Design a protein around this nucleic acid. Structure first.
Ligand SMILES: [K+]
Ligand SMILES: [K+]
Ligand SMILES: [K+]
Ligand SMILES: [K+]
Ligand SMILES: [K+]
Ligand SMILES: [K+]
Ligand SMILES: [K+]
Ligand SMILES: [K+]
Ligand SMILES: [K+]
Ligand SMILES: [K+]
Ligand SMILES: [K+]
Ligand SMILES: [K+]
Ligand SMILES: [K+]
Ligand SMILES: [K+]
Ligand SMILES: [K+]
Ligand SMILES: [Mg+2]
Ligand SMILES: [Mg+2]
Ligand SMILES: [Mg+2]
Ligand SMILES: [Mg+2]
Ligand SMILES: [Mg+2]
Ligand SMILES: [Mg+2]
Ligand SMILES: [Mg+2]
Ligand SMILES: [Mg+2]
Ligand SMILES: [Mg+2]
Ligand SMILES: [Mg+2]
Ligand SMILES: [Mg+2]
Ligand SMILES: [Mg+2]
Lengths: 87, 134, 80, 200, 81
RNA sequence: GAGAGUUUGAUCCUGGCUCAGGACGAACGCUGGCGGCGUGCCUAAUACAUGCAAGUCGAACGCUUCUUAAGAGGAGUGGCGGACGGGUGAGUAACACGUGGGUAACCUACCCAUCAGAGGGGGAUAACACUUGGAAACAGGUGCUAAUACCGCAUAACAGUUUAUGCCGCAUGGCAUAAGAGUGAAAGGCGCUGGUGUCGCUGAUGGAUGGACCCGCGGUGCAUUAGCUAGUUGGUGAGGUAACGGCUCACCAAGGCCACGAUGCAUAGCCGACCUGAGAGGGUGAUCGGCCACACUGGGACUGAGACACGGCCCAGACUCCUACGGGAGGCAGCAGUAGGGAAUCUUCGGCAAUGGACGAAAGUCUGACCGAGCAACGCCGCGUGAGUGAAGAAGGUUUUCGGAUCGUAAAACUCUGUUGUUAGAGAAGAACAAGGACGUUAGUAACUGAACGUCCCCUGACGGUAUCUAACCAGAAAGCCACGGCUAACUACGUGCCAGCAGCCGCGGUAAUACGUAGGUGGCAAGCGUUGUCCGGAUUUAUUGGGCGUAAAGCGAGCGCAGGCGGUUUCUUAAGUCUGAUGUGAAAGCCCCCGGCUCAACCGGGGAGGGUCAUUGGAAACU
């Protein structure tokens, strides 16, 4: 299925992540449909940059966030917006 | 040439050839064919060890060895330095490089590699001739 | 609605029934020397009633494969 | 790596005083070696260019590889003369910044201070002598290290601060007010020859 | 096989193949009876027609033949009838 | 967009050779302190010991063994996964790939949303119980046994198809409405109170994703490879496919490709990219990303939404292994590792803590993907191997014109520092979670639990006591390599005597060698240095940009000539080329520009730009 998940980048022991829309079958760092945000856990308040409109459109289209992306979208309130849209 | 002539028969640059061809071809025992592999050095066995006479300007007894390489090609290689321990059936390593004096010698036998002992008493440019720092 | 590629050409073979061979006759610059060269590409187009003859200027629109080589449909006979 | 051999010998080979005192050249101002005292033949154009390049890199105590990379950075700079920009970057090097402020008598001494961490930038330890110091940054001695005879003697002895530096003795803190100018740098060194050398 | 799951799939695929081939042959026999009856001009042609269509649809179900395959077969049978 | 050396007694020209620059998945030789990041079978797609690399679900089902009726096990059946992820590039000169389009000729499990259904029965069979054969592998026999396993019947046509209308396109035709004829399904589990939440089940539709096919254009050598083709080219039917189609078959014709290079041969995965270059170009296709093909060799199909399936099946073949000799078993181009080949490439390591993936309601299980650690100076970057003072200049080396000169402020001596090193203490971020427990809001209910959403409590680190921080002790443990005749920065003494030997090119050595060996000095670079190998440059040395042919290499001995190339002036017209506006695209990462983050740098991250002889559409008509 279509997944919204973290593609790891950066260097050894210095992780960074791009929140990207990708098919669940594709490799973690390989083919992906589209990038939607970034996520740097090394900052005390994990820094997140997000394309909320793109995320909401994909969620409506049926994209399934991973667990960490679900936490990220909850903290950004995107999950609440999607919930309201479903209602 | 006219532009139309060039279209009909385009330019073709000369083909360049290595100065040490024996190092550019490997061997495959299974298929018993030669491969195209670029190697910095190649191992061989001394089929004959002796001396050679230089070209006209020079006169000496230049020490050489006829070596069959790992790819089954026989070549002639020079033995740099003063004195050596090489006999026939000795396993040696060959590097590229011509010897201007000798007619058909294109390779040097690396000193300090495999059976080739370094040059005794060498103290300057020791990395060449393969002698340990004393 | 999406458009299918259409080509203008000259018929060069009609001995085959229900079909024709068309030629495009373009010119392209030689990649190295830049001289304009006569480039000829020919397609096998489907004629419903063998209306077109040899040496006729016609138009053909690409279609689903109609045979082993056919990929085009005859549209008009611009000249005879 | 870091050169550690004699300093006078390097300076007299270059024919100019790296320390700026002229002390090395004062006695025996020949090139080093047994062939020094006797005259030597004239040098070729390649030799002249090499000598100027060596002057710069030995002045700032750098290795050739890092020196070449720094030269390319100066090239990437758009405005002003390429050689002048290159020398300006050489000054902005942290070792020379400390030396200009006068916390050390010699660039070797300044380099050792920086490497051992006695120097701080804006209150933050920086052990990299190669560190690029920008205009306005505050270079200061580590609090623990401020009470060391070495830097104490160096500061009190150093009298002349270049116009482009501003220094405070009590705090042992200095900073570049502006970039050095061509004249403020060493005028003996011809940067054009070095530019041509690396232009090859 | 070297994997327990691989061995299990061998058994299940064998059983499924037996069942699928049996049912597919049943559908083919139904169509075969209808076509022979059509050629002979028999009297139960309509009954055999309905049974052939019924068999084709039941084969489409259970995933013996693709839906397009079933639709083409039904069109073929209708033109024959 | 730099040149230099070398033909000669000297010169100009022509011309080759060689060098100065840069690059590496490099190897070798001498040497070697540390850290960050990255890279590491290029050869034999050679053969592989051993270990692991794909399982999961008890909330689908029935059994079976133990723990004081529990939970923990065991194998069944059944569902999903196994077609992903990982590896290699052998094959392939081809719609394989790149780019730009087309499909009104297509399919799509899981995921989202919508509309419907979810009724009734039936017969089995593993497991199990015995029982035959055997070392086991495993093969059977009989007798039962359940299901979300299987099969019928019932209803469902919104699916498809046919007709009639209406609208529309690009020829076939597309969409909408109505009718009509034939037929098609399912399964229950968990939990609340016959009703019901939720996970499942069946039909149809749309979306998303993935896949399939067709087409324009582009990227190898050879003519000492010129003809090739016979389901071949087309048509008519039939069958087949998800789908169009010689995809297949029967008939009908004789067509089709080819100097715009077919065919054959040789070589080759293609690309983003990477090295080089002023650019045009030349070379490469490692690492990373996309696509493709392959899974011991060859062939075939089964299951499935999806394979003609790396760790599945059948057959054949080559090879290997275990046997009680009866009979069995296997495929590292998965991670390590072994042997072999080679100049040459690593540990048979820790963990699922993070990201991702399979199953499951979930805890959670699995995950040699992936995170880490290990080994190699293999590469790039960073820091050291001490700092200040220190003599008309100690001794010792070297050399002296015996005065001295040089190694040399170098050392010694004095005064400092601890990056590093050792010793001790302190010590992370990476962790977000999920589950679980509290509550609260929306939609639904008759009501609940529950669904979704929101705030709290709690929970978890292999790396690892790692990075990092603090304090104390010691200049103490930490510098080699090449070169010094010209090119080319660097010179003397001995030894040697065309010998030994050196040499990239020119060229040195024949008893006074700055060219050989050593020593002393000096130059270049530095934990590296040098040699070899390969690629681009210089090389205008294949000259499109950008060369030539009287004597340097180069005009066919001459003509006649098909094809092709080129073509006098001018009116109108067309728009193939040509030029141009707008628009779509040229993925991400990478180069380059800006801005941040790592003590700096490498490196990492953010934002741009560029990149096409790209494609659609709209224009102009000077030139061809
Ligand atoms: K199973
Ligand atoms: K000469
Ligand atoms: K020349
Ligand atoms: K499956
Ligand atoms: K294409
Ligand atoms: K046909
Ligand atoms: K290949
Ligand atoms: K194969
Ligand atoms: K498998
Ligand atoms: K995990
Ligand atoms: K396991
Ligand atoms: K020389
Ligand atoms: K030209
Ligand atoms: K003539
Ligand atoms: K035009
Ligand atoms: Mg955090
Ligand atoms: Mg370094
Ligand atoms: Mg390989
Ligand atoms: Mg190949
Ligand atoms: Mg069922
Ligand atoms: Mg050029
Ligand atoms: Mg395997
Ligand atoms: Mg320390
Ligand atoms: Mg010189
Ligand atoms: Mg010498
Ligand atoms: Mg060229
Ligand atoms: Mg001539």
């Amino acid at each position: 299925a279509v997944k919204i998940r973290l593609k790891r980048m950066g260097s050894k022991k210095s992780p960074f992540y791009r929140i990207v829309v990708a098919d669940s079958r594709s490799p973690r760092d390989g083919r992906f449909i589209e990038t939607v945000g970034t996520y740097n856990p090394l900052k005390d308040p994990a820094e997140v940059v997000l394309k909320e409109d793109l995320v909401l459109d994909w969620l409506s289209k049926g994209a399934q966030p991973s667990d960490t992306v679900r936490n990220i979208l909850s903290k950004e309130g995107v999950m609440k917006k999607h919930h309201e849209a479903k209602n | 040439p006219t532009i139309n002539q060039l279209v009909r028969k385009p330019r073709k640059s000369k083909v360049e050839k290595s100065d040490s061809p024996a190092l550019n071809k490997g061997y495959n025992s299974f298929k018993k064919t030669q491969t195209n592999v670029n190697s910095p050095q190649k191992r061989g066995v001394c089929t004959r060890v002796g001396t050679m006479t230089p070209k006209k300007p020079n006169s000496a007894l230049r020490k050489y060895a006829r070596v069959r390489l790992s790819n089954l090609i026989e070549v002639t290689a020079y033995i740099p330095g003063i004195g050596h321990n090489l006999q026939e059936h000795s396993v040696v390593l060959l590097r590229g490089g011509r010897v201007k004096d000798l007619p058909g010698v294109r390779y040097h036998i690396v000193r300090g590699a495999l059976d080739t002992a370094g040059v005794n008493d060498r103290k300057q440019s020791r990395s060449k001739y393969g002698t340990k720092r004393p | 609605r999406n458009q299918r590629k259409v080509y203008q050409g000259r018929v060069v073979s009609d001995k085959m029934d229900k079909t024709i061979t068309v030629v495009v006759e373009t010119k392209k610059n030689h990649p190295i020397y830049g001289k304009r060269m006569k480039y000829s590409k020919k397609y096998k187009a489907h004629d419903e009633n063998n209306t077109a003859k040899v040496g006729d200027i016609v138009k053909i629109m690409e279609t689903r494969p109609l045979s082993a080589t056919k990929r085009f449909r005859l549209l008009e006979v611009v000249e005879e | 790596s870091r050169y550690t051999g004699p300093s006078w010998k390097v300076s007299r080979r270059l024919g100019i005083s790296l320390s700026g005192t002229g002390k090395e050249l004062a006695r025996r101002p020949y090139k080093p070696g047994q062939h020094g005292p006797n005259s030597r033949g004239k040098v070729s154009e390649y030799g002249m260019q090499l000598t100027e390049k060596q002057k710069l890199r030995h002045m700032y105590g750098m290795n050739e590889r890092q020196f070449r990379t720094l030269f390319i950075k100066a090239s990437k700079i758009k405005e002003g003369k390429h050689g002048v920009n290159f020398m300006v970057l050489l000054e902005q090097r942290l070792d020379n910044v400390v030396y200009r402020l006068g916390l050390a008598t010699t660039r070797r001494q300044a380099r050792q201070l920086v490497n051992h961490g006695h120097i701080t930038v804006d209150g933050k330890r920086v052990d990299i002598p190669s560190y690029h110091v920008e205009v306005g940054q505050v270079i200061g001695v580590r609090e623990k290290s401020q009470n060391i005879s070495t830097i104490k003697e160096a500061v009190e002895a150093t009298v002349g601060r270049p116009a482009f530096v501003s220094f405070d003795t009590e705090k042992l803190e200095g900073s570049f007010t502006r970039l050095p100018e061509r004249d403020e740098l060493y005028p003996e060194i011809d940067e054009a020859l070095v530019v041509e050398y690396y232009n090859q | 096989p070297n994997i327990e799951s691989a061995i299990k799939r061998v058994r299940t695929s064998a059983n499924a193949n037996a069942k699928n081939s049996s049912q597919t042959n049943a559908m083919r026999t139904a169509i075969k009876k209808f076509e022979e009856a059509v050629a002979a001009g028999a009297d139960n042609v309509d009954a055999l027609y309905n049974e052939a269509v019924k068999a084709v649809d039941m084969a489409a179900t259970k995933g013996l033949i693709h839906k397009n395959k079933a639709n083409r077969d039904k069109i073929r049978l209708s033109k024959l009838a």
